[PDB]
Amino acid sequence: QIIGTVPGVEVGDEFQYRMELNLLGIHRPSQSGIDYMKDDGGELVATSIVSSGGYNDVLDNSDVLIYTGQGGNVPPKDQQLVTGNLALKNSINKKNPVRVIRGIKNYVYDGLYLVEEYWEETGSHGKLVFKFKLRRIPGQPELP
Amino acid sequence: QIIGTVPGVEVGDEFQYRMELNLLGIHRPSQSGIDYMKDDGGELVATSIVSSGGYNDVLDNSDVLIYTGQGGNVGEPPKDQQLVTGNLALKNSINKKNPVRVIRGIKNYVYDGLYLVEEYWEETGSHGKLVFKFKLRRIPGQPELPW
DNA sequence: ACTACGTAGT
DNA sequence: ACTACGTAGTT
Ligand SMILES: [Mg+2]
Numbered sequence: 001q002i003i004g005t006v007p008g009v010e011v012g013d014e015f016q017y018r019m020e021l022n023l024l025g026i027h028r029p030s031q032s033g034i035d036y037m038k039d040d041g042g043e044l045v046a047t048s049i050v051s052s053g054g055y056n057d058v059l060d061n062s063d064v065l066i067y068t069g070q071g072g073n074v075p076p077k078d079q080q081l082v083t084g085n086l087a088l089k090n091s092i093n094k095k096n097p098v099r100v101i102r103g104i105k106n107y108v109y110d111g112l113y114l115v116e117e118y119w120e121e122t123g124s125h126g127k128l129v130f131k132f133k134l135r136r137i138p139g140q141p142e143l144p
Numbered sequence: 145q146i147i148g149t150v151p152g153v154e155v156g157d158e159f160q161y162r163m164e165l166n167l168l169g170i171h172r173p174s175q176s177g178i179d180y181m182k183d184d185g186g187e188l189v190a191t192s193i194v195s196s197g198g199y200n201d202v203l204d205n206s207d208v209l210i211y212t213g214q215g216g217n218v219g220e221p222p223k224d225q226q227l228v229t230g231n232l233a234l235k236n237s238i239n240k241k242n243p244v245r246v247i248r249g250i251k252n253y254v255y256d257g258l259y260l261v262e263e264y265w266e267e268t269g270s271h272g273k274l275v276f277k278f279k280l281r282r283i284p285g286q287p288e289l290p291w
Numbered sequence: 292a293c294t295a296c297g298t299a300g301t
Numbered sequence: 302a303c304t305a306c307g308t309a310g311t312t
Contacts (some may be wrong), residue, residue, distance in 0.1 A: 019161045019306060030298040033306040054306020070305070081300075083304085103306070131292080162297060165310075177296040182312065198296025212296085212310045219296065229294085229312080250295080297307075 001028075001037045003047055004097040004112060011141045014105040018050075019126050026109065027101055034084025046087040046115065049066055049134075052103025059102065063138075065113065069130030076125035088132050091115045097137060111140045145172075145181045147191055148258060149241045155287045159253040162194075170255065171226050173248055178230025188259065189240050190233040193280075196249025203248065203291050207284075209259060213276030224269035236263045243283060257286045276277055 006025050021027040025050045033055075035048045049067055051057045055074055058066035069088070072079040072144045081089060091098060097112040113134040121129045150169050165171040171192045172179045179192045179197075193211055195201045198219050202210035212218070213234070217223040227235060237244060242256040259280040267275045 017163055019163065020296080023160065029300070029305075031305045032300075035300090050306055052306045057306080068306090110304050163308080172309070173295070173297095174307085175295040176298050176309085188312075194296055196296050201296085214296075215294085233312090252298090284312070293311085295309095296304075299305095301304100 001047060003045075004099075006099070009090055009109055011109055011111045012143050013109045014108045015109075016085060016105060018107075021050075021101060023062075023108065026099060033083060034087060036084055036087030039094065043094075044083075044087040044090055046084065046091040046098050047101035048101065049084075050101045050103065050107070052107070053092070060089070063136040065100065065134040065136070067132045067134055069118075069132065072127055072129060074123075074129065078128035079130050085130050088115055088130075089118055098134065100134065100136075102143075108143060110123045110136075110143055112137045145191065147189075147247075150245070153255055155255055155257045155290060157255045158251045159247075159255075160251055162253070165194075165247060165253065170245060176230065178233060180230055180233030181187075183240065187240075188229075188233040188236055189242055190230065190237040190244050192245035192247065193234075194247045194249065194253070196253070207282040209246065209280040209282070211278045211280055213278065216273055218269075218274060218275065222269070222273045222276035225276050227276070231276050234261055234276075235264055238263060244280065244282065246282075248289075254289065256281045256282075256289055 009138045033050045034042050037048045039045050055068035069079045069085040092115045100110040100113050113136050116133045118132045176179045177194045180188050180190045182190050199212035213225045214233040216223050246256040246259050247253050248256045259282050262279045264278045
């Protein structure tokens with residue numbers, strides 16, 4: 001469970017399957033968009049996320065990414081501040097890097113990001129959704 | 145769609161996940177336990193099976209394997225398994241006497257070698273619905289798997 | 292647009 | 302036993 005850059009894995013590096021990410025230690029979950037662990041105080045923190053179209057994420061060509069939280073069937077219900085969602089929230093204060101893998105060879109490693117903030121939105125269904133603002137840490141190579 | 149031994153793939157060779165099997169040409173389906181094709185005459189035949197715990201397969205340490213058919217919600221309202229697709233392929237493979245690759249789950253999968261399908265039968269489970277069982281015997285003369 | 296012994300953590 | 306940004310081959 002590495003935080004930050006993983007040996008041998010360069011920005012721009014591509015992969016065909018979620019499990020290749022698992023093998024390399026990039027992203028563990030087979031399916032879940034968010035991977036996390038415990039810190040040196042047992043609070044949850046985020047290590048990596050996947051944005052592959054599973055939700056309505058905002059992936060322009062900028063250093064900022066809006067990542068939707070997980071859950072809530074997205075019969076609709078409120079997303080919840082536990083697990084990955086929680087991990088991501090905590091990662092704002094912890095200011096730790098988070099690997100970002102983007103879907104498109106179906107996945108590219110996008111580099112490191114910090115979680116700057118989060119908020120709740122209320123969708124059409126009437127239920128709660130989380131949104132996380134991640135900014136790409138400066139100084140890294142660029143992905144075409 | 146190869147029948148029998150696949151180049152480079154030796155008995156005892158291990159694999160972490162199912163798509164690796166697909167890549168090597170060992171077992172094509174992403175999820176399904178049975179892989180098949182059509183023969184010179186367009187009848188279905190089986191090429192490989194996976195036994196990973198998805199059902200109640202009998203996997204002692206012998207040359208004989210009891211493999212459960214697919215379907216019927218058995219891995220969700222119970223119903224009769226049906227003699228089509230893989231099940232059918234496996235049935236036909238009894239007469240055709242062709243080898244079938246066997247991959248066993250446990251690095252989560254091992255190649256177990258080649259087997260022949262010797263017979264099949266129907267069982268009636270508690271639910272009251274039909275299930276197929278296939279008796280496969282390991283072809284003699286192959287290396288052995290540790291266990 | 293389906294069936295399907297997927298698959299890694301609560 | 303459930304949760305969850307998973308996949309091939311349509312036989
Ligand atoms: Mg069909």
